[PDB]
């Protein structure tokens, strides 16, 4: 049987379960594991983001040492739109307005002069004793201050604890953000995790009644088996089998392992995309589909350049 | 600079050619293998990654009659692109359906 595009467009549908900021559960119905895993792998490792690459330290008197603090700072998500920037070329130590961002972190811990009152907590004894992510100040280079409104280029989370100081200690450094894909380094990955699972279909091969219905309700996840008193006696039925986690606990009950059938619905996926905050997750899934279209267009242009 | 190498067999038939796709892994390879195996005029198709140290895949296509194995490769690329375009349209329409139903049911 050939590839019928019309049959695919009849049987394919997307059902959105829940979408807030930084999470998205949806369904893909009637697509194969090859393409669904392609989308999952693009979301993991090939949708580009902006992340700190070079850290120019000037003074670092903290105990969080320098090459550790650089890696520390590279793992912070930078809330930029990566589609407005470009790849820095091979060998450019100095990036321009097109392809880099700058952040200055300059925090000095001093002792709180007044209002200490011989206490013990560090929040009263010291000032700037914890270096958070709100201390990172964006340094616009070129015309980036006019291109981006104020408060747009920033880290995603302010209150990620970078380091921790004591009086006298100082962190003075400058960060350069570049664009890359998560195949290169995991700091560029835009998702917390992106994954899928096929939808389970639990069916009852035999009517289950009485205390066996309560055992059946407890051998599954809370919610899939609705045990209900129709006559006063209890019968069990499957109600929303999406909740089941395949603990397969019903296969340990010797009597009731013959009345159910756990399988999966073929080609019915449940994706979950959890953005770190760089882009909204529906935008991440759109860009992840466009990446695979770009791969196909890349090799079609290679074939047309050979011909 | 060249991403695609077409390696014909020792026979000059052009019906059994290995495609070497540089800077590529299981994503495009497995999706293309799925879409090329849908072609009735394809005898054999599989991909493999050569070594973990390298970043490329070998992709074999063997056709049956007189068509070269460049035509199923190009047709599989176009069909996978059309698949992804339709998935993009369905996904964006469903997300827009969610954002309109949600913003009006709380008001």
């Amino acid at each position: 049987d050939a590839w019928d595009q019309d049959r695919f467009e009849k049987n394919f549908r997307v059902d959105v379960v829940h979408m807030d900021e930084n999470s998205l559960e949806f369904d893909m119905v009637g697509i194969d594991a090859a393409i669904a895993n392609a989308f999952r792998r693009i979301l993991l490792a090939e949708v580009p983001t902006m992340a700190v690459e070079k850290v120019l330290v000037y003074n670092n008197t903290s105990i969080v040492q320098d090459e550790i603090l650089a890696h520390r700072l590279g793992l912070i998500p930078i809330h930029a739109d990566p589609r407005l920037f470009e790849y820095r070329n091979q060998g450019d130590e100095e990036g321009t307005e097109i392809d880099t961002l700058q952040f200055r972190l300059q925090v000095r811990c001093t002792r709180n002069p007044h209002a200490a009152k011989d206490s013990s907590d560090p929040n009263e004894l010291y000032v700037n004793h914890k270096v958070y992510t709100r201390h990172m100040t964006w340094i616009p280079l070129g015309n980036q201050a006019d291109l981006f409104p104020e408060g747009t280029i920033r880290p995603v989370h302010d209150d990620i604890l970078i380091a921790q100081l004591r009086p006298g200690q100082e962190i003075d450094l400058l960060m350069h953000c570049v664009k890359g894909i998560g195949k290169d380094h995991a700091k560029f990955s835009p998702v917390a995790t992106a994954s899928y699972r096929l939808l389970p279909d639990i069916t009852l091969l035999e009517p289950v009644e009485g205390e066996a219905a309560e055992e059946l309700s407890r051998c599954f996840s809370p919610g899939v088996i609705e045990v209900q008193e129709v006559q006063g006696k209890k019968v069990a039925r499957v109600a929303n089998p999406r909740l089941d986690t395949f603990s397969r606990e019903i296969f340990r009950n010797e009597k009731l392992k013959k009345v159910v059938r756990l399988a999966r619905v073929r080609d019915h996926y449940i994706f979950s995309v959890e953005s770190t905050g760089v882009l909204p997750p529906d935008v991440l899934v759109s860009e992840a589909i466009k990446v695979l279209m770009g791969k196909c267009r890349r090799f079609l242009d290679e074939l047309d350049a050979v011909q | 600079k060249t991403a695609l190498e077409m390696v014909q067999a020792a026979g000059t038939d052009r019906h059994c050619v290995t495609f070497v796709l540089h800077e590529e892994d299981h994503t495009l390879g497995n999706s293309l293998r799925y879409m090329i195996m849908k072609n009735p005029e394809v005898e054999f198709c599989g991909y493999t990654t050569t070594h973990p140290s390298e970043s490329k895949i070998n992709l074999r296509i063997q056709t049956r009659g007189t068509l070269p194995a460049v035509e199923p490769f190009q047709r599989g690329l176009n069909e996978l692109m059309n698949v992804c375009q339709h998935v993009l349209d369905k996904f964006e329409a469903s997300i827009k359906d969610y954002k309109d139903q949600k913003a009006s049911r709380n008001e």
């Binding site: 549908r13 997307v14 059902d15 959105v16 379960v17 829940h18 559960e25 949806f26 369904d27 119905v29 919610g223 929303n240 999406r242 909740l243 | 469903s94 359906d97 969610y98 139903q101 949600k102």
Partner: peptide
């Protein structure tokens, strides 16, 4: 783990 909002 929830009934989908967008219908078939």
């Amino acid at each position: 783990g929830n009934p989908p909002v967008t219908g078939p």
